[PDB]
Amino acid sequence: AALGVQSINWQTAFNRQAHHTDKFSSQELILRRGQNFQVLMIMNKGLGSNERLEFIVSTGPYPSESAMTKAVFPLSNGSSGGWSAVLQASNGNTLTISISSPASAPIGRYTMALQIFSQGGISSVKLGTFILLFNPWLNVDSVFMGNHAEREEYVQEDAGIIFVGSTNRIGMIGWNFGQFEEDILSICLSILDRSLNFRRDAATDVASRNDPKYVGRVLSAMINSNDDNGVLAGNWSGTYTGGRDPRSWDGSVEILKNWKKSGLSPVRYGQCWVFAGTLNTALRSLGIPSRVITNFNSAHDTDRNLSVDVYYDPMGNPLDKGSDSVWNFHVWNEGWFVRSDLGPSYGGWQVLDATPQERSQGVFQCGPASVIGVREGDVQLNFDMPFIFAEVNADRITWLYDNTTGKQWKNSVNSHTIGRYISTKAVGSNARMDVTDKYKYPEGSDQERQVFQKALGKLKPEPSIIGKLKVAGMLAVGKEVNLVLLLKNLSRDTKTVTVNMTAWTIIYNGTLVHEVWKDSATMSLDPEEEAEHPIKISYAQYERYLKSDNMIRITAVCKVPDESEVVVERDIILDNPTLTLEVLNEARVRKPVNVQMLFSNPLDEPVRDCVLMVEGSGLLLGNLKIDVPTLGPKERSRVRFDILPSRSGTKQLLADFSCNKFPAIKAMLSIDVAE
Ligand SMILES: [Ca+2]
Ligand SMILES: [Ca+2]
Ligand SMILES: [Cl-]
Ligand SMILES: [Mg+2]
Numbered sequence: 001a002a003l004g005v006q007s008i009n010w011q012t013a014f015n016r017q018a019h020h021t022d023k024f025s026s027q028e029l030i031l032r033r034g035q036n037f038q039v040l041m042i043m044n045k046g047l048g049s050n051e052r053l054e055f056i057v058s059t060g061p062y063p064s065e066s067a068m069t070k071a072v073f074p075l076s077n078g079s080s081g082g083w084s085a086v087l088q089a090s091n092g093n094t095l096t097i098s099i100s101s102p103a104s105a106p107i108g109r110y111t112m113a114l115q116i117f118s119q120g121g122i123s124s125v126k127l128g129t130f131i132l133l134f135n136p137w138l139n140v141d142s143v144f145m146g147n148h149a150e151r152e153e154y155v156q157e158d159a160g161i162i163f164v165g166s167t168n169r170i171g172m173i174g175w176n177f178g179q180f181e182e183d184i185l186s187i188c189l190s191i192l193d194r195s196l197n198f199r200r201d202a203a204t205d206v207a208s209r210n211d212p213k214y215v216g217r218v219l220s221a222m223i224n225s226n227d228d229n230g231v232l233a234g235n236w237s238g239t240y241t242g243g244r245d246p247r248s249w250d251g252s253v254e255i256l257k258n259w260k261k262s263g264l265s266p267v268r269y270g271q272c273w274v275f276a277g278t279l280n281t282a283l284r285s286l287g288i289p290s291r292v293i294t295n296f297n298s299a300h301d302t303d304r305n306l307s308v309d310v311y312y313d314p315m316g317n318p319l320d321k322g323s324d325s326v327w328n329f330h331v332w333n334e335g336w337f338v339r340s341d342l343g344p345s346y347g348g349w350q351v352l353d354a355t356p357q358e359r360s361q362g363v364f365q366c367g368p369a370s371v372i373g374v375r376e377g378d379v380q381l382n383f384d385m386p387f388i389f390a391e392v393n394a395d396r397i398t399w400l401y402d403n404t405t406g407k408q409w410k411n412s413v414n415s416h417t418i419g420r421y422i423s424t425k426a427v428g429s430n431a432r433m434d435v436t437d438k439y440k441y442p443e444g445s446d447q448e449r450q451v452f453q454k455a456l457g458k459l460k461p462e463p464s465i466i467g468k469l470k471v472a473g474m475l476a477v478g479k480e481v482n483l484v485l486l487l488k489n490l491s492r493d494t495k496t497v498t499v500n501m502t503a504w505t506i507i508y509n510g511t512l513v514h515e516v517w518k519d520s521a522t523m524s525l526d527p528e529e530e531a532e533h534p535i536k537i538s539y540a541q542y543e544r545y546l547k548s549d550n551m552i553r554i555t556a557v558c559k560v561p562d563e564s565e566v567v568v569e570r571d572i573i574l575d576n577p578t579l580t581l582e583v584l585n586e587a588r589v590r591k592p593v594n595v596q597m598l599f600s601n602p603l604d605e606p607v608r609d610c611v612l613m614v615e616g617s618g619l620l621l622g623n624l625k626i627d628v629p630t631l632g633p634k635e636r637s638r639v640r641f642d643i644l645p646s647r648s649g650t651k652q653l654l655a656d657f658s659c660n661k662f663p664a665i666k667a668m669l670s671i672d673v674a675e
Helices: 012-018 148-156 184-192 196-200 202-208 212-222 253-261 272-286 371-376 385-393 446-459 539-543
Strands: 005-009 030-032 037-043 052-059 070-076 084-091 094-100 108-118 121-133 159-165 170-176 232-234 267-270 290-299 307-312 326-337 348-352 395-401 408-414 420-425 432-434 465-471 481-489 495-506 512-525 530-537 551-559 566-573 579-583 593-600 610-615 623-628 636-643 649-658 665-673
Touching: 005 121, 012 030, 012 037, 108 184, 148 272, 148 290, 159 272, 159 290, 159 326, 159 420, 159 649, 170 272, 170 649, 170 665, 184 212, 184 253, 184 272, 196 202, 212 272, 212 326, 212 348, 232 272, 253 267, 253 272, 267 272, 272 290, 272 326, 290 385, 348 371, 371 385, 371 446, 385 446, 465 551, 465 566, 481 495, 481 512, 481 551, 481 566, 495 530, 512 530, 512 539, 579 649, 579 665, 593 610, 593 649, 593 665, 610 636, 623 636
Parallel strands: 030 121, 070 084, 232 267, 307 395
Antiparallel strands: 005 037, 037 094, 052 070, 052 108, 084 094, 108 121, 159 170, 290 326, 290 420, 326 348, 395 408, 420 432, 465 481, 481 530, 495 512, 495 551, 551 566, 579 593, 593 636, 610 623, 610 649, 649 665
């Protein structure tokens, strides 16, 4: 009889353990490039001396040896360079074979076939399929990350933290990356077979999948539904009918499964952190060390001049003209890999942004941008350096505009307000890791200014009154809003100040929603005198126009005869009433755990359409939806439900409580699941 295979033992558990891919909730053979794995092949007879076995691995619709999307290698003994198979042992008709791949092989789904040369003939049989990923553990892989703890956080961690809020109140929200959840890896892999690049030229796309730079840039495009049937549809209007309020999501899992389940129809809706969380999931799943970055006072320069304009009218009203040019915060991602296209000094963290802000080559994609390069102002390098630099270090110009006259007049220039408290989750904990120093030289330093000029060069070759807005008291949705405008006269004369104020509800990006309060006043001040003008906004006044951001823009334009206007600005954040999660017993893997949701209604009216959304990788499969009954005025809701832990360690439980009066109240609970 001719030499032939009877069966193959992929030793899946063993290889996956060795290749750090055992966390994926999948039964497939998942491997990482540049690392070898062992298989056992039972032949029908012994391997003859004059016989030969040749392995054939191939990926994509056009497997080409030239493009490295197809490799044919013989069962040798001397481990070869790229793909190779070594016969480490023969027992009976069983061949113990060690197969290795190149650290440069394209990532994705491969199929393996065997060609046998026996008794003068040739026979072929398919052995099976496997998934090959980037290998952050391999010193020669470009995504290599040497530090154990860092690699664990940036690749293996599925529970995360994303900072939000404002420069006045930095907050955080939990996020379930869930890269290990059922079918997630599969979906993230399918994204590459659905991009514009892949449809344009499938043969070249698949070949380029050996480049984290390429893969990274594609994902920045494919995570938003713009141009290519991507995953998320952005919406910063404060009205999300036809979908879900961006603030209600708790992770990337429900989003990716919804995308697939709907025939790849846009998931409605998302905002920057939603795009970044979802991107972070794809990146970690594929093996590219990744993390989420939050830039407060993020500028959106729309004409590459490193400058952004914001306008107000003499009555203190923020004009749409630029109300969103400087977001309270903007969230993006960083990918870790070397930049062979830029040089040794630019390797490391690379900015990637899936939020559709600026088009790049006609498509909404952004990055990779070397963080190091951004700090030095080398915005001539790929990709999208100019835009990102502006996001973190653009100058802010305030303008006064009177539509009635057509007149426009510059009020002031601030070179240090853009790009502050750039944060990311600390490794192994929830602490805030500030990385501003990584994106720019110290504000107020000559370097900072020297770099600015350098970057701008590559793109294009006294007041007597001081004001300040302080928050008086507690700010919570349900309570009246109390502020005070503090004004002081630094001149030697007695000044009379005319003050025009407004309060608008906004979306964190700056999108103006509705005016909820306005007022004018004139106060006389003697030299060095300090006065306070109270600003009181009732719940009734803002409740109808306040969105899930729970933000309000407060402005006061003040002026004294013969002096330029003084503009005082302050965005405030109202806290949602507290939502609480409690475990009623010790948490052990595979053992039922009793949990409790607690919420008290602070309003004098009842809350209806109450829905609880709970999820957490390793704590429960998918998302749990509970319909809680109407909660009367000042009453408490106590919801019970059990979770069933599947993986030990530190897990993150997340919940979203939504009702007619309070959309997207959030909760998070750390739970140590024991074995
Ligand atoms: Ca897109
Ligand atoms: Ca600056
Ligand atoms: Cl999967
Ligand atoms: Mg501009």
